[PDB]
Amino acid sequence: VLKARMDAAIKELEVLCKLGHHPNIINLLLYLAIEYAPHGNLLDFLRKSRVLETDPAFAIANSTASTLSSQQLLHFAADVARGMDYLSQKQFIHRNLAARNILVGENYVAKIADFGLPVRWMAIESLNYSVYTTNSDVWSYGVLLWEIVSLGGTPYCGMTCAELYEKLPQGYRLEKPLNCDDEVYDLMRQCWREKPYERPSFAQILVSLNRMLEERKTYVNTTLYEKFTYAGID
Ligand SMILES: Nc1ncnc2c1c(=O)ccn2-c1ccc(NC(=O)Nc2cc(C(F)(F)F)ccc2F)cc1
């Protein structure tokens, strides 16, 4: 996979053409050209934004942990929910929703992609019965939402993949992030309901995120404080 020249990334062929020119789904431009994303994947981008570790002098002076704002973060979440809602409409099940699979493209538009078992992202029913649906994709979207809020924190940091197989069926879920408004965590919690039919639709998630984005009130705290610590990686 190499970058060439319009900007392209030369290496699923049907998938990229058929799932149209939707702005929130990576597009197609043997050889095959994919629309180039200049900011790479969302996961590394969220981690690069952790300016307390990257530029402590700038961070401390600006009393911020992120070069990204709450408005910008929920916009990435809103983009993924929108692209996903087009996928559900097309009756397409992703099976691999993770921040590492979202590309931050031109104009900072979040684009859904699928490139390389992702236990930490999978719904209990996928882990135990290999049953994949839009409902299980909603579960993995919640873990993705959690990654956006935690600025690319590893989900279930400290717990092994094996551990999760026993801990999730008994109702264990990701804890409320410190920097997270209750309305955002409530939305993540719905994405992880044991009953697949109880989880929201992508269109509901989108509408709920648009409402927050329209508010002019901060839902994700990026402001620095004394006992401020980031969500762990590895
Ligand atoms: N900076 C970049 N700029 C452009 N491209 C990049 C990158 C990058 O940093 C890393 C990798 N890629 C890249 C690789 C493969 C692909 N291919 C794909 O995503 N195919 C694909 C989609 C879907 C769907 F997500 F659209 F549903 C389903 C099933 C699939 F095989 C896209 C993108």
Residue to probe by mutation, ligand 1, list 2, 6, 10, 16, most atoms within 8 Å of CB: 16
Which secondary-structure segment (H or E) carries 72? helix 70-89
Domain that holds residue 112: 40-234
Q: Is 41 in the pocket of ligand 1 (CB under 6 A)?
A: yes
Question: How far is Cα 41 from Cα 1, in angstroms, rounded to an integer?
Answer: 14
Q: Which amino acid is at 173?
A: R
Residue 105 vs residues 34, 116, 143, 160, 186: alpha-carbon distances, Å: 12, 18, 21, 32, 29
CA of 114 to the centre of ligand 1 (A): 5
Q: At what angle do helices 134-149 and 70-89 cross, to 10 degrees?
A: 170
Residue with CA at minimum distance from ligand 1 atom 26: 113
Triad 186, 190, 196: Cα angle to 5°: 175
Q: Is 115 in the pocket of ligand 1 (CB under 6 A)?
A: yes
* Other residues' Cβ atoms within 10 Å of the Cβ of residue 86: 18
- Match 């994947």 to its residue by tokens: 41
Question: How far is Cα 233 from Cα 154, in angstroms, rounded to an integer?
Answer: 5
Residue with CA at minimum distance from ligand 1 atom 33: 113
CB proximity list for 90: less than 8 A, separation 6 or greater: 18, 19
- Resolution of the experimental model, in Å, one decimal: 2.5
CB proximity list for 89: less than 8 A, separation 6 or greater: none
Q: Is 114 in the pocket of ligand 1 (CB under 6 A)?
A: yes
What is the token pair recorded at 173? 């879920």
Residue 97 vs residues 4, 88, 105, 157, 223: alpha-carbon distances, Å: 27, 13, 17, 18, 28
Question: How far is Cα 222 from Cα 1, in angstroms, rounded to an integer?
Answer: 34
2-4 and 8-10 strand pairing: antiparallel
Whether the CB-CB separation of 121 and 192 falls below 8 Å is answered with: no
CA of 32 to the centre of ligand 1 (A): 11
For 105-130, what is the HEC assignment?
CHHHCEEECCCCCCCCCCCHHHHHHC
Question: How far is Cα 140 from Cα 122, in angstroms, rounded to an integer?
Answer: 6
Question: How far is Cα 154 from Cα 100, in angstroms, rounded to an integer?
Answer: 11
Question: How far is Cα 169 from Cα 202, in angstroms, rounded to an integer?
Answer: 24
Whether the CB-CB separation of 97 and 118 falls below 8 Å is answered with: no
| CATH number assigned to the domain comprising residue 139 | 1.10.510.10
Q: Is 113 in the pocket of ligand 1 (CB under 6 A)?
A: yes
Please provide the DSSP assignment of 39-64 as one string.
Answer: T-BHHHHHHHTBHHHH-HHHHHHHTB
Question: How far is Cα 117 from Cα 132, in angstroms, rounded to an integer?
Answer: 13
Whether the CB-CB separation of 144 and 80 falls below 8 Å is answered with: yes
Q: Is 37 in the pocket of ligand 1 (CB under 6 A)?
A: yes
Please provide the DSSP assignment of 160-209 as one string.
Answer: -HHHHHHHTTTT--PPPPTTB-HHHHHHHHHHT-SSGGGSPPHHHHHHHH
CA of 105 to the centre of ligand 1 (A): 11
Q: At what angle do helices 182-191 and 134-149 cross, to 10 degrees?
A: 150
* Other residues' Cβ atoms within 10 Å of the Cβ of residue 142: 26
For residue 38, the Cα-to-chain-centroid distance in whole angstroms is 18
Question: How far is Cα 187 from Cα 210, in angstroms, rounded to an integer?
Answer: 13
